[PDB]
């Protein structure tokens, strides 16, 4: 039950223990490259609930992206650009999910979970072999990850009329003149 | 009301009879696979929500677990013998429960269930 | 368009695709339905002969006078 204790600890990010660990770890990541492989998740509870397993084929890449704005505001998220850059470096892998690990005042740090679709362990195992299908190539580039779903507005209700089922597709549907044979 | 470029989004339904034949052939394909079975699934009787339409009934999505148990049909066997199950709908009144239970017993009277293997 | 013109200009043969279909349109096998199914009739016409019901839903239009497969 160690992960339930980790869930509560990650809720208190300003506590003395977590603030201390985040301060030292922020300095360490800054001495490393912008994109580098992490041998192990720094938040094992968060990685686990996002779909990470300790099999051969699961990797973590952590990345820091410069924060701020372009007064223009990017419609995608800083988390979206973090996933997209990691996917380009690991072009053979499939991005599964990503999570926040640290912020700092100049950057913003995320850890990305990736799955290898050409590994036998992934292909033989269900629950993950759906990602082996070609319809899941570069999900982060198409907005198919958790961040992209939030940015696109794929929620049900009267507050999401214009953007669920595709914003552009809905506009085309509403702006198409349909003429039948017997008018 | 043509202030936008309407000409590039104009859909003409010249395939209306072609799609009907395609739809009729797809229905025939289901009967080809499920040869003795019906091509649809039994659906319950529900009341329309609004006060404008509450005096009229229609077909729902699937049968409630309570009214499926009152009929005498197990949960895990119902989707297998051609009955739709809806786990989201609640009864809230004996009138809806009785109407759909009677519908299920009428379905059981007309059923021909074959041995498994 | 340029590909189509190139093929008409070329000496390579045209690959005529046979009309293969994903789903079969008639029952097959050695069961009662397959041995009694008439390929030239419709779904309702075949089920009406069988004495069975084809659609458990609501009738969405007018049927033939002798139809007995639509409830």
């Amino acid at each position: 039950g160690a992960l339930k204790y980790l869930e509560e600890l990650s809720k208190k990010k300003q506590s003395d223990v977590v603030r201390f660990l985040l301060r030292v770890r922020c300095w360490e990541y800054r001495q490393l490259n912008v994109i580098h492989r992490a041998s192990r998740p720094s938040r094992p509870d968060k990685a686990r609930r996002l779909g990470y397993k300790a099999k051969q084929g699961y990797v973590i890449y952590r990345v820091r992206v410069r924060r701020g704005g372009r007064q223009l505001k990017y419609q995608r998220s800083l988390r979206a650009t973090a996933e997209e850059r990691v996917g380009r470096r690991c072009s053979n892998l499939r991005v599964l999910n990503s999570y926040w690990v640290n912020q700092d005042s100049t950057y913003k740090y995320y850890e990305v979970i990736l799955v290898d679709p050409n590994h036998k362990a992934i292909r033989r195992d269900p629950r993950i072999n759906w990602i082996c299908n070609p319809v899941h190539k570069h999900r982060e580039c198409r907005g198919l990850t958790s961040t992209g779903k939030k940015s696109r507005g794929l929620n049900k209700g009267h507050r999401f009329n214009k953007t669920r089922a595709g914003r552009r597709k809905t506009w085309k549907r509403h702006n198409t003149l349909s003429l039948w044979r017997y008018r | 009301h043509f202030r936008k470029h309407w000409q590039r989004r104009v859909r003409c339904h010249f395939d209306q009879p072609g799609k009907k034949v395609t739809r009729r052939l797809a229905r025939r394909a289901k009967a080809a696979a499920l040869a003795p079975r019906p091509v649809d699934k039994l659906r319950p009787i529900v009341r329309c929500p609004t006060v404008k339409y509450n005096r009229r009934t229609r077909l729902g999505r699937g049968f409630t677990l309570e009214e499926l148990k009152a009929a005498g049909i197990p949960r895990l066997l119902a989707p297998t013998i051609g009955i739709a199950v809806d786990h989201r709908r609640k009864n809230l009144s004996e009138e809806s429960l009785a109407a759909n239970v009677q519908r299920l017993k009428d379905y059981k009277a007309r059923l021909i269930l074959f041995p498994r293997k | 368009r340029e590909l189509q013109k190139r093929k008409r200009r070329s000496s390579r043969p045209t690959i005529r695709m046979p009309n293969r279909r994903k789903k079969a349109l008639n029952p097959a096998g050695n069961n009662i339905i397959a041995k009694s199914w008439n390929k030239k009739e419709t779904l309702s016409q075949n089920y009406t002969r069988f004495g069975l019901v084809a659609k458990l839903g609501k009738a969405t239009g007018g049927t033939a006078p002798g139809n007995k497969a639509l409830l």
Partner: peptide, 21 residues
């Protein structure tokens, strides 16, 4: 397929049925 999926199909497979007119 998953083992839990196989168990469900082992004991609850699709049957053959008909409805009288």
């Amino acid at each position: 397929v998953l083992e839990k999926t196989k168990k469900r199909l082992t004991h609850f497979p699709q049957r053959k049925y008909a409805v009288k007119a």
